[PDB]
């Protein structure tokens, strides 16, 4: 219940100014020593806590690792940026702490932080796709991991997360958003005899790449067809006529109901990021053919 | 330059089990204190880090300000669990690793892995078979393999 109004009140109890940040999931040390005060209701507009609703008097358990903990305007160098992407807009996600450069961890990354880091960067938040495109790993450190955010928070240090600088992740799993107009984004299909066969080809602010079938299926192919106009999908192969170019991006798809008028409405779909070598691309045959 | 055979070495020493994970950069603090052992050479198999031979004593010139960490066998919370099964000695195995629930890898499972996980579970071991009976897939992490 360590809302943000109350967590700039500890910051102005202190003189250091609005709460830039809230640690979160006891990033300063572990829980070592009991408990006096919690589940207290404060607008946030106090001058202190002491003059606040406190509301019940109860007592619970908390984690020694899930304890509270603040950063302060005076003592921020937090910043975000993109490195390494096709535009300005897409790329690898890095944040600055402690007068360093990390990246944040891919764990609980969805579309709703990439609307938060996007809006927050000034990029366009028309379509917000998660996924580093056309980046490599990071290097260095890993500050964030496991962000979760609602989708109205003005940053994504707001948010709900883990402790800074300790993650089990992996820098092959690095984080990243892709911010569009949703004028870009363009789909084909090339190699099958005419437009409504072949294998799906995206071009995303002008990179060319493919679609995995992981998980894919008549009623995903259903939705391509659709938004190209050529009728419902039937199966998922062709009969080739042609040779298409190979790419080594990829669009990765989570599941979609099949009621969709386009393929960039599916829940979750990553542009980039991620190589998958066990599956194949994925083709479709419409009913137009 | 730490690595995971040094954690090896120093679980080893302190009889905790095997390294099952190792905490890199300042993970557990900015670097303070004195630093006394890095860049030494281990082969993994050596009771104690000292004991192991290295390059010499002092023999580093460690930089960036930060402080080492393990996670042993002791110190993680492994825990075994049977989820979505008709009987609390069926169903889909779950693993407890760095505090999240997760699966097991289907690749080299047969009737001794089962039969180790009846008997650590407290289920009886007269007749033990493998298959999550109509347990679903998980949506966790998988950990074991
Ligand atoms: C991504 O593409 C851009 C633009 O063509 C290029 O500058 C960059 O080096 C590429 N990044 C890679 C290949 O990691
Ligand atoms: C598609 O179906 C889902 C599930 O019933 C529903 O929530 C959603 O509103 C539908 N979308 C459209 C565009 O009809
Ligand atoms: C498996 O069967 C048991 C026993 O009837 C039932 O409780 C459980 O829900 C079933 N699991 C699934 C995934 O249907
Ligand atoms: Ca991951
Ligand atoms: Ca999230």
Known sequence: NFNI????????????????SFSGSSNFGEGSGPIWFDDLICNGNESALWNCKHQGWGKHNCD???????ICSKG???????VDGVTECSGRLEVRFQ????????????????????KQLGCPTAVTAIGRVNASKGFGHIWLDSVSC??????????????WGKHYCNHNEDAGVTCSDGSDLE??????????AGTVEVEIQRLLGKVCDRGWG???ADVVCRQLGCGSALKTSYQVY??????????????????????????????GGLTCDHYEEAKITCSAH
Do not use: M
């Open 187 to 196: 789909l084909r299909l090339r190699g099958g005899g005419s437009r409504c």
């Open 242 to 271: 042609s040779k298409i170019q190979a790419t080594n991006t990829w669009l990765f798809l989570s599941s979609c109901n099949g009621n969709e008028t386009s393929l960039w409405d599916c829940k979750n779909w990553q542009w």
């Open 64 to 70: 020694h690792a899930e304890d509270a903990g603040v």
């Open 150 to 163: 609602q989708g109205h928070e003005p940053a994504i240090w707001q948010c709900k997360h883990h402790e």
């Open 99 to 118: 007068g360093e450069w990390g990246t944040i961890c891919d764990d609980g990354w969805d579309s709703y932080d990439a609307a938060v880091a996007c």
């Open 76 to 82: 921020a160098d937090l910043s975000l940026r993109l």
């Open 5 to 20: 109004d109350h967590a700039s009140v500890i910051c102005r109890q202190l003189e250091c100014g609005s709460a830039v």
């Open 218 to 220: 008549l009623k995903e």
